[model samples]
Every structure is written in structure tokens, then in C-alpha cells.
Target chain A: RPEIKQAVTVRPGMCGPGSLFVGQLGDWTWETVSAQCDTDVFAARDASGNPTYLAFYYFRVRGGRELHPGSLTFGDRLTVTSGCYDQGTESVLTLHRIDRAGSDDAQRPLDLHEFYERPRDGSLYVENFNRWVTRSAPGSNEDLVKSSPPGFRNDGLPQLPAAYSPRAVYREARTAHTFRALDEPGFRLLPDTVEVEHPVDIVRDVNGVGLLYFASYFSMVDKAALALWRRLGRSDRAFLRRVVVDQQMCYLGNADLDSVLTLGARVRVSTETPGEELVDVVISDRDSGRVIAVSTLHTQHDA
Target chain B: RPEIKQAVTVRPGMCGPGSLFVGQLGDWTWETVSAQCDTDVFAARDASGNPTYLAFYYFRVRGGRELHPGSLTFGDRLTVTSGCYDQGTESVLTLHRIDRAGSDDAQRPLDLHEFYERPRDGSLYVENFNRWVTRSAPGSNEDLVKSSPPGFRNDGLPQLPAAYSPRAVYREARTAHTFRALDEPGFRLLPDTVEVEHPVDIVRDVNGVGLLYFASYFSMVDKAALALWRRLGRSDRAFLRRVVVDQQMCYLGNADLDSVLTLGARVRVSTETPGEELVDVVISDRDSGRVIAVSTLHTQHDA
Candidate 1:
């Protein structure tokens, strides 16, 4: 198991509704700034899953919020961004500063992806193909409001725009002394512009990593494979006793067919062979020839 | 229990499609036209609970359409009406017929008060006021489709207009010899105005023992009351069985609420008190002196 860090605690001090702190992983410099937390609870946690920073809010304002010292998960491609604000009033919280201790990897910098992307010369374009199915706006708007931007068309398939930019926030992540994020224009970067600035806080080494292991192509393939394997291995372990008794779907062999027969129902031949890769089914009625149900199962390895 | 009508075998030769027949009882005569069943089987038992007269149709032009007969019940106010026809399709069925049957009275004609008033007198207005509560249309559109006029408003509460004539053949009943039904100018003198003219071959006795019941004010009123009572009764039964449960509305001394507790669900209230004239109810808060619980009961009697 990877070593966990649990020493970080949110700094307690006099701050406005939108006040927040940000900093680097290797250094312990902090600065207060403005941020917003609309219709949600913005909280932070330590490496051991202990909550350290908690900012409850009811409205959206402006500013950059900060997480506990090293609460961010470790992933070279993932980033956890949060909108935080004051308890009752509407005020944006700006990132202040951060303090990093221990190995650079374990530090789990809050904005590692932003830190690395700031120095890149290529334009930053993050296309969320599935965002159409599940939007990312604040509050219930994310669930209800949606649109197809540019190259994106609703043709039963969610396609990304030919060119679109991610919601981007920029800052000088590499510079430990760039505490006053607003004083430097280099800290602000347009979503579509290649020349952008973002600290190594939200993404120590990744950006939107959840879109990977938890979403998109790779995750589905892996989860399906894992679920299939588990099902196969537990074929006789009674893993799905209720389902077996309910519909006998968990039956391994003829038990399933027997249950179906008991209910006076017949299964289509194709349904019994979900793994078949080649189908040559010939259904013949009173006028047609002998009915034929032919099929072949092609293993993925054959490809 | 009221007297049950003799089991009269309605033979084809007597009530075949293409002609109309009139049956006289006391001072009034009920008129109806019959039609031959095109297919083999028809679900005979009336679902609407009225004594079999005109049957309600289930539209399936090509198949054996089911028919629910309009049975005469208590508080039924019968009507005698006329008919009309187009060039090709002879109006074999009767017309402008409205028979109001209540749960407690005999059949009679429709009354002016029972007729739904429209902003424009020419425009007939109907409402889905009392339908089978359990069999209610699921949504607004569905309810309208099932019960609304110009379409079959299955809202369940079906009300026929005073001079309304059906253009197409309804699935349930048949029109016999008087198939070519037209509104006769003298029909207004015949109570109910729904002239069910018998064939010339059949003796037309307008005097002594002749069966001719004109649309009278008293008969229409009786029919209207009967219609309202039966409509409400059907809905009340639906509410009791599906919503309130069978035991809730049982006869006081004879009906046992516990026995009718079906489907493994217990009855909330006893049978006896359900249909009683009056009962007490309490409302009050126990902790706070908010007077949440209070009791009251009232009753009345008709001379």
C-alpha cells in the first residue's frame, strides 16, 4: 500500500466569505484569495480520508478555493477541483498558498495538472464527449441544462466539438513565490489559448483523471471485463442467490432453461448465445425450409 | 332485491341487423335497433353493470371485437329515440337515444338539467366527472383519448347527448330492420324524441296497446337522475376496491370488514360503520395545545 499523509489541517484565520488559500507541493507559502461555491458544500480531506477543509456555501460568487495540504488523490492524469465559499453569504474564495512536506509524489499537490500544463506550448483542449449525456454545470443545471456546441451533434452518439476548450483557470504553479495570483497577468489563461498559467495545485501531475479510470472508454471496458470474470468465477458460489430464485438468470447450465420452461416460456436461440460472434440463423415457417439456428462464437484473441 | 327481468332469448329473426324494435312496459316503450355479430365470440357479461341493452364497443375492425352490454339497473330511466343514415352506409342503428339508469331507480329519458351545458348551445359539452377511480386514465392526454368526444373518452363516465346520433356502427350492439333511422318531424311529440320506428311489416299500433313513449319532461328527469346515480356508483365501487379497500364500505350488520381484507392487506376501517348515516371523527395534538384532535358527527332523514 502507498504511504498515506494525514498531517495537513486547514489554516484557521480571519477570512471573508470568498477567502481561500493556495500554495505549492514542495514549499509552504500561503496566500488568501477569492472563490465561489454555488449550491454545494466545498470540503477538503487529508490523505487518510479525514476532512480538513470545509466551506459550506449556498450561492456562487468568484475566487479560487484551496484544499487541505495533501488531501488530493495521486494520479498523473486526474485533478480534483472544488468551488468553495463562506458559510452563509455569497463571496468567492481565492486560493491563498500551500505548504508541502514529504516526498514530492506523496505530497499530492492540489493542482498538479494545472502546474504541468502551464509550461506547455500546445493549446489546451479538453473534449468531454460524454458531457452531453451528463453535463458539468453547477447545481441542478448540470443535470437539466445541456447543449451541443459546434461540431457536436445529437445523432444518438455523443461526439465532441471539432474544437472546444475546457473550463480553465490559470496561475503560476511552478513559482513558489507567486502567492499574489492576481498581481501577475501570466496567472490568468484563456480556456482556448495555448499561452496559459495554472499552478501545480489542482493537478500535481494530472488533469481530469476521473475521466479516465472512472469514466470514458477505458473504465467501461475494464469494469465489464471485471464483472464478467467475477461472474464466471462465482458461477457456483451462489453470488446471486436472489436473482437465481427470482428468474434463474444465475443458473449456470440447463437450470436457467428449466426455469424458463417452468414458466411456460421459450427462449430465442440468439439470447442463449450472447457471446456468439457469427450468426447465421435461418428461421423457416410453414412456407420456408427446415428452420436453422446457426452461430459461432469468435474469441477476442482471434482478432 | 328488485325483480329481475325474465331471461328472454333475443333471436336473430326477431332482432337481426337491418331493423329496429320497440318494447312497451306500462305507459312507456323502449326502442332499439340490432346488428348481427360478424365474428364468432364476444365477451357477453356486461362490464358496466347495467342490464344488457346497447353494448359498448372495443374497436378492432378485423377481429372479434368485445362488447359490453348496457344492462338496465335500478333507477334506470329508459329512452326511445330516432336515427339517420348516409347513402352507402344505411343508418341501421337508432339515433338521439339517451337512457339514464341510476343505482336505485328505473330506466328513463335524459333531463335538461342532466345535459351538460355549453358556452354555445350548439356545441355539446361533456365532462369526465365520475369515472372508475381505479380505471382512471393515467395521464391528461390518455384520459382525454379514452373519454373525450370525437374520440372515445374512456374516462369511464360516458354520457350521451339528448339528440346525439352515432355515425359509425358501435362494436357492442347491432341495428336490426329499422337500420335506416331518421329523425321524424313528429318524433318531438313522441317522448324522448328518439324514434325507434318499427318496420312497416310490423304492426304500427299508435292507440290501445301500441307501444310509443314520447320524450316527456318527467321521463327525462327520471333518466337524468338515474344516470347520475349509476355514474357515481361505479366510481364509488372503484374507489372502495382499489383505493379504500372492500371492507371499508361494507354493509353494517352483514358485511365483515375482516373477511374482505384481501391480497394480504388488512382493512383500515370496519364494514358496518362505512355506509352508516354518520360517525364521529377526532382531531387534536397531544403535546401542544393546538387543538389538533376534535370529534364531530351529523345526520339527516328524508320524509
Candidate 2:
């Protein structure tokens, strides 16, 4: 009966922004007040008793506004809650940011939806993700975000799109994951495309305890769209607040030292939604043309 | 000159919290308002016309109080500025957090000291970081954190400790890097130590577009110290604001998936400074006992 002597308070602090990979969360410091919280907060474990990391098959940042870091001052407190069910399959950490203006003013709910894998398998799972796969099952081609049978699944596992309904099979965890298919970005004709040959320096790039970066994949994405971002007025730029990384490092792992990566992006404004823009990003070994990552980002003009 | 039309604004947004590796920043998107800002913002480039990602030999978040993400809200603006000097060896990004209470409130200066390398070397260089190496040469055993001559320099380069006084040689760039060697973290009687066996899951861990994580080294560090953080009263915990990652991934790179990592941390409260605590962290491959990273974090009880 080893009980925690400390009280867990969801204080305002920094956590990794990684929404896709559990490996990213691996870079974080997991804080749990109750001994059960650790298992609750992190949903997966193996038969050998080793905890499994997360690999989000399909994740999306749905409704609710996120609190800007600057908005939180010292001494502020946040209410933290979570959902972990299905013996470690679907999970989410929800934050309730209470407004100081007064109670009843409003609370901001912030969250990301992600699912875990089983048996420590090596195969990447697509059909397993309930959110993206279940929603797409409606066979909605008009989806604002589209998905096709991935030509390949890196984990070496074969995937079949689920024909199941987005209904009451573990509703709470499922609800946390399921996202509705909306209007397609109606995007094409990307006016901004950037191609840069950035050679990775083994010395300058690999320094540190590990090549730990507080860091910059976003830096490259920002560069790809820098031309367009430069042109937009601050109001328009600032208004596009809701950002969602449609996909993150899915196919390749870290590039090698002294390797050159062909980094680029194609972006277009969405007529379906004003102040909406979608940027398709690509990073690959310039010499090998081996893909490092292919992803998308959508910026919504938020209030 | 190819110019930038973007009025580069540093709105409160998320950047990688990586303090050690440039590979982490590879996950970022570089945003620049001016063509020169790109070169200025990123201080390295090779003769072959490719930009070298940063490999910070030494980087310290000195002085300024960091902005807790919650304090920032929508519609707030921050003035952005940078310093990059060279022919390319030193750089910094500073942020100004303004108080709406009025102009007389006060201004906060935030800074991190980092130095770069040259000729795209494959080796790691410790003789290079000005703050750690240069200040350490003062021969003070009383250093709050004492660093001995590293038995090996991973970059395969040889070294010499300069007896030169910290002076006006390259002032601003150097000042950004030079920190007065401070008091030692003190005599050791580690009250808190945690060791855990966590096997990496290739399917669960690697189930992503790639193993890209917004993600988790800190989590392990936090886990090591969670028992301590749990025991503390909120005030004692909250008062500690300034966090310094004394050393980030300096020797190792990323660990492999499916590999077991022996993650642990040793922590003790500082008698020299109240609320000042240093957490020494170590991560290694369990099988080979190969060290992944060793870092120190100092938490100062802040206002």
C-alpha cells in the first residue's frame, strides 16, 4: 500500500506540443499525483508489464480554443481532467482554463485526440485509428480533410478501412477521437512553393546531450510559407489562429548527419472557409529522395 | 537583395522546447520577415550554399524570467528581435513581454547563450561553448555546478583550455554567452532517486508518419523527480520559476525504438539558495549501458 504523499495540482507549466507520436511525449516529463494517474494518463502497457508509448494513427485538434501561453500569468491555476479507457486504447488529456474575469465568464477546453497500439507490434496502423477511419467510412469524398488507403503502412502491417459506424462502441473514448468530415479545403493552385537545399552539418547539427532541439521542424514549415506569410497583413495573419498538424513524421525517421533535405511546402487559401489556409509539407533526403515526412497544416481565422 | 515583406512578428506561439539538439528544431518551421532575417535568425551556412542547422555546444537560459504560457492571451503582441554575429559562431533570440498595467510596470530581458561550430566537423566540441568552457577555466571548485575536463570530446577534436581573461575580445556575442561561474550545486546527499525499466514499443512507439514527437525526454526526467514534486506544497513548488538546462544532449543522439532505456534522475534541495534545486538526469541504453544523455536543471524559487 504505497500511497502518494503529494497532492497533484494541474499547475500552469510547459509540456511538449507533440500531438502525433508517443515518442515525442517520450521527450516529456510525465507528472502524476496519484499512482493510478500515471497508468490512467498513459494508456498502454505490454504483457511483460512494460508501458507502451503512443503512436497516433489519426489525431486532430477539434473544437474549443487553446489558451495562449502569454495569457497565463504566474499564480494562475488550471483544472486538469482526462479520459483513458479501453485498457489503454483511446485517450485524451483535457484542460479547463478558467477565466479570471469571473465565474460564468467561460472556461476554455483544450484537447487532442490520439489512439495507442497493442502487443508492441512493428506495423504502423491506419485502420486502427477510430477518428480518421471511422469518419471517412461515411465515404465522404467532400471531406475538408481527405484520406486514401495509404499506399503503404510503414509498420509493415496491412490495413483495412473500417466499415463500422461512429456509434456507441465505447462512446466517451470514441467521442474524444471521432471527428466529423467537413467541407474539403477546396485547395489547389498553391501560389507559394519553396525549395531549399540545406545540408545537415554533423558537428553543428548533432551537438548536445543528444541532438535534442527545443526546436524547429516548424521552422522549415514556416520557411516554406514565409513568402505568403510575409504578404499577409498582421490582422489576417493573427486571425488564422487554430492550427492543426494534419500529419507528422509518418514514413521516415530522423535524417542522417551531413545529409541534404529537400524541404518544401505548397499552400493555398480556402474559399470554403475565409481566413482558412492549408499547407502541404514535405521533407525528404535530397540525394535519396527518401521521404522524411509528408504532412499538412490548416490555419483557421479564429476570433 | 531579395527582401522579405513579412513583418516578422513573434506572436505567442509554440516552438520546440528542445534545449539540446538542432535535429529537434528540424521539426520547426523557420519564419522570417526579411531575407536577411533568415540568415540573421539562423547563423550558420556552408560554402556549398547550404545552411547548417544549429548544434549548440553550450546553451544556457540565463537571467530573464520566462513567460508561463497561460499568462498570454489572444490579441496580445510581443516585440521580436535577434542577434547573430559571425562569420557565424554565436546567436540568440530575445523576447519582450509587456505589461498592460502601464508603461511603468517593468521590462523583462530574456536570453539564452549559444555558440556554433565551423567547417561542418563530425566531432563534438566542448572547448567551444563560451559560457561553460570559458567560465569553467576560472578553476573554481565552488561552482554551483562543477564540470571537469571531459575525458573525451565526442567530435574527435583535440582541446586546449585558454588562460585568457573573459574580456572585450568579442563582447556582445560573447556576453550573450559568458556567465559568471556561479556557486556549486553543493555537497551531495541525494534524497530523491528513481530508476525505471521502460521498454520501447516499436509499433506503439513508432506508430506515426514518423517517430516525430512534440515530445518526451523531460517526461522521464520529471518521473525521476515526481515523488519529490509530489511531496512539496504548492508555494514551495510554484516559487521556483527560473529553469536552467545546464547541459542538453551533448554526447548522444536519439535512442532507438524497441530499445530499453534506463531512465533516472537524482535530485536534492539546495542549501545555498532556497527554492534553488538542481536535478541531475541520466538516460542510457539498458542493454549496452550506453549513456544517452546527462543533464542538470536548476529551479530557482521565483517571485
Candidate 3:
């Protein structure tokens, strides 16, 4: 069983990675994919209102250890019996099948070592080793080689309050200040970059944390999201004819602004765009109250 | 004569309030409300997709001390001049029509004093008098009361900037620390107010000016255009939510902090309701950033 790291509850119409099952375990016997063994298939909608399958594979096995260096190479076959339907239209994402197997690497092939065990509902809980599970053929799951125990279905998923990661180590550090973008990620740049020519300014503080402001159309966020935007901050409210900037890069470092910008030194943030909006916003070297940056995800149409 | 506030060469759909209307006064004189009054009547769609008329009225006139006491009133009277269209389809504003003779208390009488005169090009400019000018029966130019001399039908009208007596007072103080409300004539608020449920703890420096905080809301401002909202003040962008104090009373301060209640030790400025938003906001507090309380008409809406 693999110990859970974190879990989030999402309602319909929400997107992102989700966990269907999380637990800890050790080595087990392998089972062949068959029609009798019912496979649980999950489905969700993409941004474009398309229905897609969300599936994960598991294997039911008994106590055994083969020391298979290439665990990811252990191939398996997947058979899906699930379907999606939209009364008036076609589904966004459709799942016909899923194929998964062990990894083909020798570096700690899917760490299956039992770190510790926990007891729940009068049942003993076993921890799994720190190993990376191999996920191949994300497109179509036709060959499922591994088998998961029937009892280890999506039944006892760990919730937040009960998130007790035994195999995970915890550390705490106290600093004089905290970074707002510590958790926010950045957007990934797309393959064919869109050339934006505008004059923008960068405002920085003595601590070097700063912000960027440029006039941009709001919809530009779509392209930013696809490029793996790292917590691209968005305007908390509705904005009209404004510039867009990198949310994660714009931060408030711990420092007095008057001492940072007004020390008779020219400390300014530079930008590369100047569209229709003829407005200038100080990105850094200002009080915390003057900072206005947002995080967002880019989402293009039709994927 | 009323001086030219500002003007611009607008495109078909490129005009709005507070927007400058450039071009020689005579160029737009006959173009004002004449039969050649080419209005950009866009088919504005309503929330229900119903198309409505959107007419932009721009005109000018002239008046002096003699026109102050005129008993003439402006009004709108629509008649089927060209086609037998639906009577309800006519979009003349009854209150905006200029009527020299009418019997209505709320009716705005055509006043020469309300005219704007241009000296450079010798043209007239009539502001949005908020009164409708009434014309004679559509087919008959019978009651065309000409106020200007001959050859001055449109060009003879006088134009000037705002009045001098009372309006000049505010115009001089416009850049100062004080300002008057829309209908407040000479009376002026401190630009900020502070109040509380109990005795307020007052504090002041060597200057007699006392720094305080007041709670304000959309109901008072009606919108973000405050008489002195853009005044020099510090705002915080972090505060995003509202705090409820009691029944019928909610604070529109920042959303990040706890309820700022201390038995009236500290009192701030505030406004009365019917608030103009989903809630109210505090005028003065540690929070920064713009809010409805700062607007001339204390209201914040998607509109």
C-alpha cells in the first residue's frame, strides 16, 4: 500500500489531478486481467466540455518478493466496461480502456518496502515502499497486467483531517518572513510562443522580490495555463482592459518600502509591453497594501 | 461662454460619459439635434436579447445672467413623422427635452445660463441639462421659439465654461483637500467622516487636523465616482472580504483581518444605507485599495 501525501475534495465542474485511492502496503502476488474482475473506471469533463476517463490501475496479490529490478516492465492488460453519455451532446472525454504495468527502471523499481503499519477498523494497515509507479499508455488502457485486491477498492480513501503519512517525514522552519508564492506554481510556456511587444516595469525591493505589470487582455490566461503556468495569479475581481503579469514572480519581500525605493537609488521593475491601457502600477518598492497581483491558470479552447 | 472641457473624434461606437467631444463648436452645432442629427443609434441588446435604441445626444447653447430666471422648460414629445411605427418604439427621453414653455414642477426650463460658449471658434456647447426639450408637433415648425438673433439660429447661441459665482468656488477648491457633493451647493463635508456606537477616542498631532476612519458604502457613493474619492490616501490591496458587526450593520473593511470591534475606543468615518452593494464598507481603516466607499456614489456593482 502507498501512503497518501495529500488529498483534496472536488465537486463537479472542477479540474485538476485527484486521487481515487491511497493506502500503504508491501509486496504481493500478481493477477492476470480478466473479464470477471470488475474494474472501476472514472470519467470527468475537460475544459472544453469534453468527457474523458479518469482511471488508475492496481493489482491484488499475496505476500511475495521477486526483486524484479524492472518492475515497471511487468506488462499488464486493461479491459474497461464503462461508458459515458450526454443526453443532448457527446461527452467531453470518453474512456474506452486503460493499460498500465510496472516500470522498466532499476532505480528502486516502485519502492514497495513496508515502512510501517497502522490499525484501522480492527484491520492491520501496511505501508508501502517509496517507489515510483510506472504509468504508460495514458491514452488508451487496453493491457492491464497488475491486479489490486478487491477489498482495496475506492473504499477507505484517506481524508484531510486523517492525513497521517507514516512514511513521509515532516520538517518545520521559522523565518522572519514568508513568501506568498511558495505554494503558487507558474504557467508553462507553449510550444509556439506568442510574441508580445509591450513596455512593462518591474518593481523590486531590497530583498529582491518584486512584481510585473503590463497591459494585456484577460483571455491571455488561457495560453499561459497550457504552458504550465505556476500559480499564475488572477485579478480577484472582474477587470476591464488591463495588463496581465506573472503572479508567482510578483511577490512582497520582507522590507520597509521607503528604505527600499527612496534611498536616492533608482530601483524599478522593467516590462516589455504597452498596449492600449496607459496605466502604470508600481510592482515593488512599495508597502504591502500597494501590491495587487493575482494567480490564475491558462486554459485554451478545444484543448 | 462655456469653455471647452474636452473633446475627441469618436468612432461609431466609441463614445461615453466624461468622454471629451472635440471638433469646432460650429461643426457640431447643426449636428446637435437637427434633422441631420446623425445619432449612432446602435441596436443595444438588453438582458433578454431585446434590441433597444441607444442615442448619443451632444449639443451646445449660450446664456448669461439674463437667462437665469427663464420660465422656459424642456421636454420630449415624439410623433409619427415618417413611419407608422409602434408608439412605444420611439426612444425620446421626456425629461431630456428642452421646453421653453411647460407646466411641470420637475420639468427643466431651457436656461441660457446653462449654455457653454467657445471663444476660440465662437461656438456653443450645451451640456446634459437633464431636461428634455419639447418641440412643436412634428410636421409643424409653428412654435419654434428662437432665442438667438437671426443668422444665429444654431451659430448665434452663446457658449462658455461653467458659471463663476458658486461653481467657481468648487473649481478652485477642486485640487484642494475639501470638496462639495453633487447637490451640496456650498456646503462641504470633511471629505471623510468618522462615527461609532460609543464615545470615540480622538487623537491629533501638532496640527489641528484629527485623523479618523469612517465606514462608507455603495448606497452613499452610488458608484466609484466620489466627489473626492481619488484624494491622496493609502489603501491596502490585501483586504478582500467584509465583516458583519450586527443586524442591519456590516463593515466593508478588508476581508483579511478579524472583526475590528473595541467598544468604541476607535471611531472612523461611515455612510448610511441602503448600502449600494452586497454589503457595506469602511471608509477609513488599515485596509487600502479602492472600494465603493471612495466613489462619489457609494455603490459597487457589476454595472
Interface RMSD per candidate (angstroms): 43.7, 18.6, 29.7
**Per-candidate DockQ vs. reference:** 0.01, 0.02, 0.01
Per-residue lDDT, model 3, residue A149, is: 29
> Model 1: residues >4 Å from true position, as ranges?
A1-109, A112-223, A230-303, B1-303
- Residue-level lDDT of model 1, residues B20-133, one tens digit each, is 111111011111121121111111112352112111111110101111111221112333222212111111221232222222222323232433222221111111111111
DockQ of candidate model 1: 0.01
Give the TM-score of each candidate. Answer: 0.14, 0.33, 0.18
Q: What is the lDDT of residue B101 in candidate 3?
A: 27
Superior candidate under DockQ, 2 versus 3: 2
- Top candidate when judged by lDDT against the true structure: 2
lDDT of 3 by residue, B67-162 (tens): 210111111121111100011122221111122222232133333343222221112123321111122333221222212111112232233334
- Model 3, runs deviating above 4 Å: A1-303, B1-109, B112-170, B177-303
Between candidates 1 and 2, which one is better according to lDDT? 2
Per-residue lDDT for A88-182 in model 1, tens only? 22122222112233333434432324422331211111111011112233211112222222221122212223231111211121121111232
Order of the predicted models by DockQ, top scorer first: 2, 3, 1
Best by DockQ: 2
List RMSD in Å for every model shown. Answer: 34.2, 22.7, 27.4
The CA lDDT at B252 in model 3 is 23
- Candidate 2 residue-wise lDDT, B1-303, digit = tens: 121121111111222222222222212212221122333212233444332332222322222233322222322333322222111123222112223322232232212222221211111111112211112212221111212122211222222224321122233222221122223445344565667675642211221112212124444444444434544434322422234423332223344444677766665566666656666656667666565545455555453
